[PDB]
C-alpha cells in the first residue's frame, strides 16, 4: 500500500515520513501547496455564483410560462432543481473545505459533499434514460405525454436515491478523494463492515452500464431505422456532454477500485472529481443554445 488508510479515510500519500494527518483534523498542506487549494476554492466559488442564477432562472421561466410543458421542458425543470440541490447542499461544503484545506465539518461535511454530487449526477443520467425512451417513442412510433414525463421525473429521483443514499447508512461510505477536498464512494478500501466491494459493483452495473445500454439501444433504433428534430438534436448533445463530464471520473474510479493501494498521488482523482462538478451548470446552457422556444421565453421574462 502506497497510501495511508485511516478509520474513515484513505490519503493517496505515504506516511513513511510521518507527516500525514487526517483530512478531518488538519489542513492537507503536506500533499499540496496552499495555492493549489486556493485554485479549487476559486473554481467552486465560480460554479456556485454561476450555478445558482442559471438554474434558478431556468426553474422560474419554466413555471411562469404554461406553454413549456413538453417532456423536455419537464426534464430540464427537474435538472434545474437537482442542480440547485447540488449547489446549496454539496458545493457550499466543497467551497468551505477547499478554503480551509480539509473537511472542517468532519464526516458530516464529507457526506453532504458526496451525497449531493452523486444524487445530482445520477438524476442527470436517469433523466437521459427518460429522454432517450421519449425520443425513441416519438420518432420510431413503436404517445409520450405530460403524465409519462412526470412519471419519468419521479423515476429519476427514486433511481438516484437508490445509488446515493446507501452510503449514508452503511452500504459503502463517502470518503475524501484526491487532495481530500471532495468526497466520493469508497473505491479505495475493502472495509468489510460496510460491504464496499458489492456496492461498487452495484453502482457501476445498475447506475452506469444499464442506463448507457438503454440510451444507446434507443439511439441505435433512431439511427438504424423541424420541431421534433430540434429536440432530438438537443438530446444528442446532452448525452455527449454527460460523457465528457463523467467518463474521466468513472474511469479513474474504476481504475482505483481494481488497483487498490497502488501508487497514485492526490492530483490523480482531484482533476476528474472537480471537473465533474460542472454537471451542476452545463445542462441549462445547452438548453438556451439549442431550444428556440425556451430561449425566447427566457428573453421575454428577463426583459
Ligand X SMILES: *C/C=C(C)/C=C\C=C(C)\C=C\C1=C(C)CCCC1(C)C
Ligand Y SMILES: *C(=O)CCCCCCCCCCCCCCC
Ligand Z SMILES: CCCCCCCC/C=C/CCCCCCCC(=O)OC[C@H](O)CO
Ligand U SMILES: *[C@@H]1O[C@H](CO)[C@@H](O)[C@H](O)[C@H]1NC(C)=O
Ligand V SMILES: *[C@@H]1O[C@H](CO)[C@@H](O[C@@H]2O[C@H](CO)[C@@H](O)[C@H](O)[C@H]2NC(C)=O)[C@H](O)[C@H]1NC(C)=O
Ligand W SMILES: CCCCCCCCCCCC(=O)O
Residues within the annotated binding site for Zn(2+)? 197, 260
- Which of 20, 185, 238, 269 is close enough to bind ligand X by CB under 6 A? 185
x-marked contacts with ligand W along 240-269 as a string, rule CB under 6 A: --------x---x---------------x-
Distances (CA, A) of 147 to 73, 74, 152, 230, 279: 13, 10, 8, 22, 27
Tell me how far, at minimum, the Cβ of 264 lies from ligand Y, in Å. 31
Residue 29 binds to its own copies (criterion: CB under 8 A): no
- Which of 2, 108, 296, 300 is close enough to bind ligand U by CB under 6 A? 2
Tell me how far, at minimum, the Cβ of 275 lies from ligand W, in Å. 4
Binding site partner of 2, from ligand W, its own copies, ligand U, none, Cβ cut-off 5-8 A by kind: ligand U
Residue number, nearest CB to ligand V: 18
Applying CB under 6 A, the site for ligand Z has a residue count of 49
Q: Give whichever of 180 and 270 is closer to ligand Z, judged by the CB atom.
A: 270
- CA triplet 120, 126, 130: central angle to 5 degrees? 135
Q: Indicate the annotated binding residues.
A: 197, 260
Binding site partner of 161, from ligand W, ligand Z, ligand V, none, Cβ cut-off 5-8 A by kind: ligand Z
Binding site partner of 147, from ligand U, its own copies, ligand W, none, Cβ cut-off 5-8 A by kind: its own copies
The alpha carbon dihedral of 67, 231, 155, 55 has a sign of negative
Question: H or E element: which one contains 141?
Answer: none
**Residues 271 and 251 sit within 8 Å (Cβ to Cβ):** no
Residue 173 binds to ligand X (criterion: CB under 6 A): no
Residue 303 binds to ligand Y (criterion: CB under 6 A): yes
**Residues 174 and 115 sit within 8 Å (Cβ to Cβ):** yes
Start-end of H helices in 10-70: 34-64
**Residues 41 and 96 sit within 8 Å (Cβ to Cβ):** no
Tell me how far, at minimum, the Cβ of 281 lies from ligand X, in Å. 13
Tell me how far, at minimum, the Cβ of 11 lies from ligand U, in Å. 14
Start-end of H helices in the chain: 34-64, 71-85, 92-100, 106-140, 146-164, 196-204, 210-223, 227-258, 266-275, 282-290, 292-302
The alpha carbon dihedral of 292, 296, 298, 299 has a sign of positive
User: Which one of the spans 21-29, 125-133, 197-205, 244-252 is the region binding ligand Z (CB under 6 A)?
Assistant: 244-252
**Residues 10 and 20 sit within 8 Å (Cβ to Cβ):** no
Tell me how far, at minimum, the Cβ of 99 lies from ligand Z, in Å. 14
- CA triplet 275, 281, 284: central angle to 5 degrees? 140
Other Cβ atoms within 10 Å of 234 Cβ, number: 21
Binding site for ligand V (CB under 6 A): 4, 6, 15, 18, 20-22
Binding site for ligand Y (CB under 6 A): 50, 302-303
Binding site for ligand U (CB under 6 A): 1-2, 261-263
Amino acid at each position: 500500500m502506497n497510501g495511508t488508510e485511516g478509520p474513515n479515510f484513505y490519503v493517496p500519500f505515504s506516511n513513511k515520513t510521518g507527516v500525514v494527518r487526517s483530512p478531518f483534523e488538519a489542513p492537507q498542506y503536506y500533499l499540496a501547496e496552499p495555492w493549489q487549494f486556493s485554485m479549487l476554492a476559486a473554481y467552486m466559488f465560480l460554479l456556485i455564483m454561476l450555478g445558482f442564477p442559471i438554474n434558478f432562472l431556468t426553474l422560474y421561466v419554466t413555471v411562469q410560462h404554461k406553454k413549456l410543458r413538453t417532456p423536455l421542458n419537464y426534464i430540464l425543470l427537474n435538472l434545474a432543481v437537482a442542480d440547485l440541490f447540488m449547489v446549496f447542499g454539496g458545493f457550499t461544503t466543497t467551497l468551505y473545505t477547499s478554503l480551509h484545506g480539509y473537511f472542517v465539518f468532519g464526516p458530516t461535511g464529507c457526506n453532504l459533499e458526496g451525497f449531493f454530487a452523486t444524487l445530482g449526477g445520477e438524476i442527470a443520467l436517469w433523466s437521459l434514460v427518460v429522454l432517450a425512451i421519449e425520443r425513441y417513442v416519438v420518432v420510431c412510433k413503436p404517445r409520450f405525454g405530460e403524465n409519462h414525463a412526470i412519471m419519468g421525473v419521479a423515476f429519476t429521483w427514486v433511481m438516484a436515491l437508490a445509488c446515493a443514499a446507501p452510503p449514508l447508512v452503511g452500504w459503502s461510505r463517502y470518503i475524501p478523494e484526491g487532495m481530500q477536498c471532495s468526497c466520493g464512494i469508497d473505491y479505495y478500501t475493502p472495509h468489510e463492515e460496510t460491504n464496499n466491494e458489492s456496492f461498487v459493483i452495484y453502482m457501476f452495473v445498475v447506475h452506469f452500464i444499464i442506463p448507457l445500454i438503454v440510451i444507446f439501444f434507443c439511439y441505435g433504433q433512431l439511427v438504424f431505422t423541424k420541431a421534433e428534430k430540434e429536440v432530438t438534436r438537443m438530446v444528442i448533445i446532452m448525452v455527449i456532454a454527460f460523457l465528457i463530464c463523467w467518463l474521466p471520473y468513472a474511469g479513474v474510479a474504476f481504475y482505483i477500485f481494481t488497483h487498490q493501494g497502488s501508487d497514485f498521488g492526490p492530483i490523480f482523482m482531484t482533476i476528474p472529481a472537480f471537473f465533474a462538478k460542472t454537471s451542476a451548470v452545463y445542462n441549462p446552457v445547452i438548453y438556451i443554445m439549442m431550444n428556440k422556444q425556451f430561449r425566447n421565453c427566457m428573453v421575454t421574462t428577463l426583459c
